[PDB]
Design an enzyme around this catalytic site. Sequence first.
Site: not given
Ligand SMILES: [Hg+2]
Length: 410
Positions: A16-17, A21-24, A92, A303-305
């Site tokens: 996972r990356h 920073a919070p994407t949003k 990222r 990614h986590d997904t």
């Molecule tokens: Hg996560």
Amino acid sequence: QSEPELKLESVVIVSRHGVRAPTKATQLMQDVTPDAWPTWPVKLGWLTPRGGELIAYLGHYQRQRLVADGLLAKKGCPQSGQVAIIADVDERTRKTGEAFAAGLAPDCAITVHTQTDTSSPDPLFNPLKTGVCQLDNANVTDAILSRAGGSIADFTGHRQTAFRELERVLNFPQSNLCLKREKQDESCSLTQALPSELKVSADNVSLTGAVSLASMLTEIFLLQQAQGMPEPGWGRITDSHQWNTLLSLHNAQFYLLQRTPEVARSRATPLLDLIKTALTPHPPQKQAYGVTLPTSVLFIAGHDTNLANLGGALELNWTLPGQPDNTPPGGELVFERWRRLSDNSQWIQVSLVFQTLQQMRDKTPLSLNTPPGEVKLTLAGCEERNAQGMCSLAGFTQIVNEARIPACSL
Ligand SMILES: [Hg+2]
Ligand SMILES: [Hg+2]
Ligand SMILES: [Hg+2]
Ligand SMILES: [Hg+2]
Ligand SMILES: [Hg+2]
């Protein structure tokens, strides 16, 4: 002494990356907390230097570990085509690739391969979004709700303890959303103010409301922590049990939307195929991404997904001691092929390598003496195994072929 009976022959790391920073920074977010969210050093959704260092630490370690295992030389740059690095098109993930290379072989020019068109999604990391294949709505709707105990309300209803803990951290009661409550006759509650609806389309699955908001909010608290910010969640998160309770909302959303087989199998197919091919022995050859497979080590920045999808598809379940996030930034799903010297039969091992939350908080350097956490995984669908508990290459190959969705292959 006693010689090794197994010899590591191939490694594939799906990572996972790193911390980002919070994407949003939406308006809903500021309405559920009267407090001010702390600003970050880099742009949203971008990897932070600290994030890159943390990833590089994992790289330093894997180099040491692989050397001890004799797959990689102890000195100098790995041979041309010995280590391949692939990354989703995002900033990222691309930098996580670099950060890992830099730590694995500093000063060495290991390129990070990505889809040539960086302005467009890479189907390898999600064949749905780019229309490579679709989800069967009805079947997916029933699978997800089935996993939720029949309804999202009951799902959330069982995790109110965690939702209340979150509300506590946000001081939600004195929030704008709560204050301007049009039904101030009932008490304030995230799950009530923001009802979570399940939305299923051909290329996507979502859960609106508090389920998805909490997943994002709790993760951010984790990100602050891993980034070493002064007081994550405004100094209201003071112990391990609170960290776990908070992040549990994060894991919950993924248990439903990303691990559900009806979603996981299609969304994980492209990677399953790559992993299987990379782990299977055959004549090296410039393939997808201009890379050559087989080789020795393949590192995939995702990614986590993706890790959650693979876990769902391969039926791999885990809990990471010291790490509340099931698939944390930097976390690595590791596949290894070992050859049994005895009869030269092929075997595969799967594990999850991660940094405990504390190891990220203190940015502690890793190596054989101070290793990252590790959890050996078991394929619940594997019958044929060896004395080491690994699955045979034929078993694993079977598990992969039965879990993949032909229609979603690249
Ligand atoms: Hg996560
Ligand atoms: Hg390339
Ligand atoms: Hg190949
Ligand atoms: Hg390979
Ligand atoms: Hg490999």
